[PDB]
Design a protein around this ligand. Structure first.
Ligand SMILES: Cc1cc2nc3c(=O)[nH]c(=O)nc-3n(C[C@H](O)[C@H](O)[C@H](O)COP(=O)(O)O)c2cc1C
Ligand SMILES: Cc1cc2nc3c(=O)[nH]c(=O)nc-3n(C[C@H](O)[C@H](O)[C@H](O)COP(=O)(O)O)c2cc1C
Ligand SMILES: N[C@@H](Cc1ccc(O)c(F)c1)C(=O)O
Ligand SMILES: N[C@@H](Cc1ccc(O)c(F)c1)C(=O)O
Lengths: 219, 215
């Protein structure tokens, strides 16, 4: 592959400052929403936020991500059963006292109503390796990180398109969900995001973010 | 304590338009390995980090430390560290496959951007925290990485460039050098600023939507 000049949209410092400020205020309104209405949402928006996630950087340009989108309530209902069953055992046995306590402030449990109500579920699978065209294996360097970075971009894009979600990690649900969705073995489930509009009645926990001087260190 | 969630809603047509234009802005983002020494406004840097800090995180743990280096001398020390360790990585440690897999990008162990970039951002994950005792940081690496994604969109939005790097085997030396505690581990390093006038990128193509999305 050949290398080409990079061209760059410049801004005056004054407009950089302003774009950076608006975008802070925009993403700072983002909250994880666990109560999602059944109102349908336009698929062109979903298509576009996925395509935005696909602009992410990736280790050695491997693009190791598969975004699986479910609209079908029958499929969504099987997903729900799998996750509620597995999470009930997670909460009652596998997570441990300390994790369960650390979650009290969030009021989460194994009941995940959003898996039926939300019109869209996005299941983000990482590809632990890939395949060349001749069927031999290719290495996916830093695949989990690459996929999580694209997930961060996806979240930004959703916030900026006026949709809500909550990033979830359905512990011990990977295999059953992979099989149910007909995905191949080199894909593993990394996170699941219900997507739509908030419910009229949606709450969030009243959490504060750290001030800049507790996350940023200069030298 | 739990409160009502106040959303900011767009009509379908503004949803489509905002999402389309945000795709277009982010699809112009490229990893840039040649960075000008022209200084950049620290108010932007503060803002983009602030933005990264809005990321979700496992059990609301916020396990990230963003270490921003502007000082020439420390930066030259970071460069010496990374060049030494990447030399051994390319010669010995990565293996032939991995080195062959990087030919298209034309990377080696010389990392000039570590001196010329006005700003380095080093991202440390906190693999646990402290209350007296230690706190569990659930999904810390994934949380931090999600924060770095948000940071990259923010940088792209604010007119700056960077490249996401993972300086293999350099974490311990950089940690100690920069005064960070033993519960922080280096996850990645982003040199930040304007691209050099002569900057190039490799002529890579992204997958079409139907090769990354299954319905
Ligand atoms: C997890 C991860 C680690 C990376 N590590 C390095 C690195 O150590 N050195 C480097 O030059 N580029 C690194 N990159 C940048 C990729 O090589 C780059 O994203 C890819 O070639 C695609 O180009 P683009 O970012 O311009 O789309 C990394 C990217 C990711 C996601
Ligand atoms: C890696 C990761 C995993 C998460 N997993 C879950 C989950 O399994 N269930 C859930 O309800 N929320 C999950 N969350 C959402 C967090 O609890 C949430 O981000 C945090 O409480 C802060 O709230 P905010 O997103 O409103 O800032 C996860 C977040 C991240 C980053
Ligand atoms: N870390 C090595 C090479 C490299 C390594 C891994 C990557 O995934 C990558 F894209 C590039 C370097 O900075 O040159
Ligand atoms: N995955 C579990 C537990 C959980 C909840 C919230 C979290 O932030 C988290 F890290 C883990 C759930 O969805 O209830």
């Amino acid at each position: 592959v050949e290398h080409i000049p990079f061209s760059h949209n410049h801004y005056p410092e004054k407009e950089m400052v302003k774009r950076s400020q608006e975008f802070y205020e925009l993403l700072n309104k983002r909250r994880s929403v666990r109560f999602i209405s059944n109102e349908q949402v336009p698929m062109e928006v979903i298509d576009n936020v996925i395509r935005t996630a696909g602009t992410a950087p990736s280790g050695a340009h491997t693009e190791p991500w598969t975004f699986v989108v479910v609209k079908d309530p029958d499929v969504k209902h099987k997903i729900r059963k799998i996750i509620e069953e597995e999470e009930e055992i997670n909460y009652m046995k596998r997570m441990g006292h300390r994790w369960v306590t650390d979650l009290k402030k969030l009021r989460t449990n194994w009941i995940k109503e959003y898996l039926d109500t939300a019109p869209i579920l996005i299941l983000i699978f990482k590809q632990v390796h890939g395949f060349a065209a001749n069927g031999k294996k290719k290495v996916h360097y830093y695949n989990e990180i690459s996929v999580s970075i694209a997930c961060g971009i996806l979240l930004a894009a959703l916030q900026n398109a006026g949709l809500v979600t909550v990033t979830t990690a359905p512990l011990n649900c990977g295999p059953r969900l992979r099989v149910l969705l007909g995905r191949p073995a080199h894909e593993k489930l990394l996170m699941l995001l219900p997507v739509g509009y908030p419910s009229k009645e949606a709450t969030v926990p009243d959490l504060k973010r750290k001030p800049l001087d507790q996350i940023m260190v200069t030298v």
